Amino acid sequence: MVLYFIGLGLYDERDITVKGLEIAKKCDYVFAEFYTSLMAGTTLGRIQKLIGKEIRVLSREDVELNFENIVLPLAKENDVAFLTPGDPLVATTHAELRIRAKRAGVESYVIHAPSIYSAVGITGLHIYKFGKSATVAYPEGNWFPTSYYDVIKENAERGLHTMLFLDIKAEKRMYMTANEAMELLLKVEDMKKGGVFTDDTLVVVLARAGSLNPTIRAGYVKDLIREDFGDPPHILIVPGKLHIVEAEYLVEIAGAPREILRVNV
Amino acid sequence: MVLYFIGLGLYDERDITVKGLEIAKKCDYVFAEFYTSLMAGTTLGRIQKLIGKEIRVLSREDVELNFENIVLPLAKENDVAFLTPGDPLVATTHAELRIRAKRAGVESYVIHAPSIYSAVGITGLHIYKFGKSATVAYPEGNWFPTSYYDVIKENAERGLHTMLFLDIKAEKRMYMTANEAMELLLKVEDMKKGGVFTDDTLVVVLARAGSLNPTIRAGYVKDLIREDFGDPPHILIVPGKLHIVEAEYLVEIAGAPREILRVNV
Ligand SMILES: Nc1ncnc2c1ncn2[C@@H]1O[C@H](CSCC[C@H](N)C(=O)O)[C@@H](O)[C@H]1O
Ligand code: NA
């Protein structure tokens, strides 16, 4: 009679919370999805060993189209868990799943875990200064989407930071690197010419948040566009004007050039 | 000879991640602060029991003025942990403490935990749609903070949601309720008269996120301003333009007036 939405956290199998783990262990059935994102520092087998439960993986279709036929029926007479990377209900379409549960007469509870939305705080950028967020998608065929560029423009104009999710092909295990994101934005800039993203724009790259050894790099596009930030996934952030304390952190912790202490403050 | 910034999470001692617990258990010294937020479902005793260590609680003054004299010295010959509610770097100035650690020649690591910043996902409002955030601070003497009003205005003009962290006076054991925040906002509206926050404004209240039964309520200020949302902590949210599915969730899960289902595109 109960469905638990449990977050797996940021990077590896130890990023789930104590509460999430213990609840998952008490559930009769455990489902999970890895299409919104993947857990780069672990594997399905490792997650299964930790929880001590067989984990049934669901595709995007399984969830978006058949959540009520796959998961909810079992939640009617059993305790069921639905695992997702990060914090549950962060992914745009997930909240609606709770409405589906309600409609099926199924109780649902949310067990939180770390999300990249809050983990980006490790970049030293103040959380309150983040504006609307967006996702950088690849142009394809006769389609060249550029809304993420406008998001950066509107946030920066108001002195706000912009966190950018990069394209991911979960099934194909293909990720867009920060380097690729930068090249794309420069391309959009050449077309838009709004002076939003150029070789002189200061950016921050965050890779493997959650790991004990994440990669946090800050610098101008001209110098970072060909740098190696390691394995994906990568998060690209275009900061708005910096508070001196944010700049100092980027210099001391993210290897930013001293230059930002005068140029971007 | 290392320092760990470990978040304890949203509500109780089990909101810590497995990673954080296992690391906290093996630290020689454990410090913590409980002035940046409130963990309404646990006690220092329960936290110490879980980690199996005596915890030295520090005041805002101990940290802000003496972190380098109290904590860092021990981090040179021992493994030390600094625990905080929620995520250690979210809506705190703790990130700067990493600079102090570095300058003191002490390596530091950050272990994230669920944060209220991402926990807002449980309100059904798309997290990417949140704009600049703000804090509603208690007026003091002749000083009456009002900047948070302009933040709501700026975001609303852009159709973005506004998350409002609420004030806290740990030493006085005072935690601002959503009701108090609404009263303060109405007073600011009277002064500025920008039509930003009135009795007809739709707001969402999230209380005690992290608990199994948090209070999630949506409605007009006139109807919620005197409603009991249970014990603190609380956060107040002023949504911007709603997507149909956001309104549906607010009605089905947050008990919002069915009339908001009819969005004015
Ligand atoms: N469980 C919870 N439920 C509702 N609001 C919460 C909350 N935890 C924190 N807050 C809100 O955030 C304020 C503290 S700001 C510090 C936030 C913390 N670092 C984190 O990561 O969550 C509180 O005064 C309150 O308004
Ligand atoms: Na945000």
Side-chain angles (χ1 to χ4, degrees):
Chain A
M1 261 305 285
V2 171
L3 169 60
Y4 290 102
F5 287 81
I6 303 175
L8 293 175
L10 304 162
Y11 189 65
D12 56 58
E13 76 288 339
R14 294 202 299 167
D15 291 337
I16 184 174
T17 65
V18 170
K19 180 181 299 174
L21 175 57
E22 309 195 320
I23 291 180
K25 289 186 171 182
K26 296 182 178 180
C27 293
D28 303 293
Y29 296 97
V30 182
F31 296 88
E33 64 82 12
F34 295 107
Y35 66 79
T36 61
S37 178
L38 295 173
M39 303 290 288
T42 194
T43 67
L44 177 55
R46 293 183 175 179
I47 293 172
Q48 276 193 163
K49 182 62 158 56
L50 173 67
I51 296 178
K53 294 280 190 178
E54 307 62 49
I55 298 179
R56 178 180 170 181
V57 181
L58 304 174
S59 65
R60 176 191 292 287
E61 173 188 288
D62 289 340
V63 174
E64 304 190 319
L65 176 67
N66 295 309
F67 198 71
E68 57 264 56
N69 299 311
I70 299 172
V71 182
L72 304 186
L74 292 174
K76 255 299 181 180
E77 280 292 322
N78 309 287
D79 283 320
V80 180
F82 175 54
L83 316 171
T84 63
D87 192 17
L89 279 72
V90 160
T92 307
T93 64
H94 288 187
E96 192 265 346
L97 298 182
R98 292 196 79 195
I99 298 178
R100 296 198 206 184
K102 188 191 177 188
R103 297 290 178 60
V106 178
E107 293 174 56
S108 74
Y109 301 87
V110 182
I111 308 304
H112 299 282
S115 168
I116 188 64
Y117 270 97
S118 53
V120 289
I122 191 171
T123 60
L125 297 171
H126 305 327
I127 286 295
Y128 81 92
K129 290 178 66 177
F130 280 81
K132 182 180 186 176
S133 308
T135 298
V136 184
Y138 287 112
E140 56 187 305
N142 297 116
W143 200 249
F144 201 128
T146 64
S147 72
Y148 53 83
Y149 173 95
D150 303 327
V151 177
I152 299 176
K153 176 189 176 303
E154 295 308 313
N155 283 329
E157 183 179 307
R158 301 169 171 68
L160 303 178
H161 308 313
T162 302
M163 181 182 76
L164 300 167
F165 285 98
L166 308 185
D167 190 275
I168 176 176
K169 313 286 209 217
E171 310 76 52
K172 290 183 183 178
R173 308 188 75 73
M174 290 170 221
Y175 303 79
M176 177 195 273
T177 63
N179 310 84
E180 288 180 282
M182 286 180 245
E183 289 280 27
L184 255 186
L185 283 157
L186 290 177
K187 198 172 184 180
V188 176
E189 174 59 47
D190 193 60
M191 301 184 277
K192 297 280 192 173
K193 291 174 179 173
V196 178
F197 197 90
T198 72
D199 282 303
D200 297 311
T201 297
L202 170 65
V203 300
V204 179
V205 176
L206 176 59
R208 301 183 309 288
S211 167
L212 287 183
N213 300 286
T215 290
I216 317 174
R217 290 283 300 109
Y220 298 115
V221 179
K222 65 189 178 187
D223 310 307
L224 272 60
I225 194 168
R226 288 181 288 285
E227 184 173 336
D228 177 51
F229 308 107
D231 299 315
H234 296 162
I235 287 292
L236 181 63
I237 296 159
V238 177
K241 189 167 96 186
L242 305 174
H243 169 196
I244 183 65
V245 178
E246 296 177 304
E248 298 179 304
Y249 183 107
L250 294 177
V251 169
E252 305 299 319
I253 305 297
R258 300 171 300 177
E259 194 180 330
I260 73 166
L261 290 175
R262 61 169 178 282
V263 176
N264 311 93
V265 167
Chain B
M1 57 178 268
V2 60
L3 171 66
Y4 290 106
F5 287 82
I6 307 174
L8 295 181
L10 301 168
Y11 187 68
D12 54 58
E13 73 290 340
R14 291 205 303 168
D15 287 318
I16 189 177
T17 61
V18 167
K19 174 174 295 166
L21 175 62
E22 293 183 349
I23 291 176
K25 287 184 173 182
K26 301 313 204 286
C27 281
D28 301 302
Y29 295 107
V30 182
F31 294 85
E33 61 84 0
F34 291 100
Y35 63 77
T36 54
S37 186
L38 174 63
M39 293 186 72
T42 190
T43 59
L44 176 58
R46 291 175 187 169
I47 299 173
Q48 282 183 170
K49 183 178 181 179
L50 180 60
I51 299 180
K53 295 248 135 89
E54 209 68 50
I55 301 174
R56 180 176 173 182
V57 181
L58 305 176
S59 66
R60 180 184 291 281
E61 190 178 301
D62 293 325
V63 178
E64 287 177 24
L65 299 188
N66 292 112
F67 194 73
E68 59 270 57
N69 308 122
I70 296 174
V71 180
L72 298 191
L74 290 174
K76 301 182 180 182
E77 300 285 299
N78 315 277
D79 272 43
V80 184
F82 178 55
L83 323 178
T84 76
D87 179 289
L89 308 182
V90 174
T92 73
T93 53
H94 290 329
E96 181 274 327
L97 300 178
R98 297 196 72 196
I99 297 177
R100 302 193 202 180
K102 181 187 175 189
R103 286 172 181 175
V106 178
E107 285 292 297
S108 73
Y109 297 74
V110 181
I111 309 305
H112 303 282
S115 171
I116 185 63
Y117 193 70
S118 72
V120 298
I122 199 172
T123 66
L125 297 171
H126 299 338
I127 191 156
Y128 72 91
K129 288 177 66 179
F130 278 75
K132 182 181 192 174
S133 304
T135 298
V136 178
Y138 277 123
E140 291 297 309
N142 296 135
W143 188 257
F144 198 123
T146 62
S147 60
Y148 52 82
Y149 178 91
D150 301 316
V151 174
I152 301 173
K153 181 184 185 186
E154 179 182 292
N155 289 330
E157 286 184 336
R158 297 211 283 150
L160 305 172
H161 310 315
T162 302
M163 179 190 54
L164 303 169
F165 291 97
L166 302 190
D167 211 353
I168 175 177
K169 303 289 187 173
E171 275 168 48
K172 285 199 195 180
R173 296 198 322 173
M174 287 195 67
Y175 310 99
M176 183 184 279
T177 63
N179 311 82
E180 298 181 309
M182 287 183 254
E183 294 286 3
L184 286 172
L185 276 162
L186 289 174
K187 291 184 172 64
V188 178
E189 173 61 55
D190 278 324
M191 181 176 86
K192 296 183 179 294
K193 302 182 178 304
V196 179
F197 195 86
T198 70
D199 286 306
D200 301 314
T201 299
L202 168 73
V203 299
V204 181
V205 177
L206 173 52
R208 306 177 307 289
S211 66
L212 276 291
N213 294 116
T215 298
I216 314 177
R217 290 276 301 114
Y220 307 116
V221 174
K222 65 187 179 186
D223 299 309
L224 279 58
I225 194 164
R226 283 177 294 287
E227 185 175 337
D228 181 17
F229 299 114
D231 298 326
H234 299 179
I235 55 160
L236 178 68
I237 298 168
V238 179
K241 182 172 62 173
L242 301 174
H243 267 78
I244 290 185
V245 69
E246 288 179 314
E248 293 186 307
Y249 185 104
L250 293 181
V251 173
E252 294 294 327
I253 309 296
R258 296 193 62 69
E259 67 189 73
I260 69 164
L261 286 180
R262 298 189 294 291
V263 188
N264 287 304
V265 298

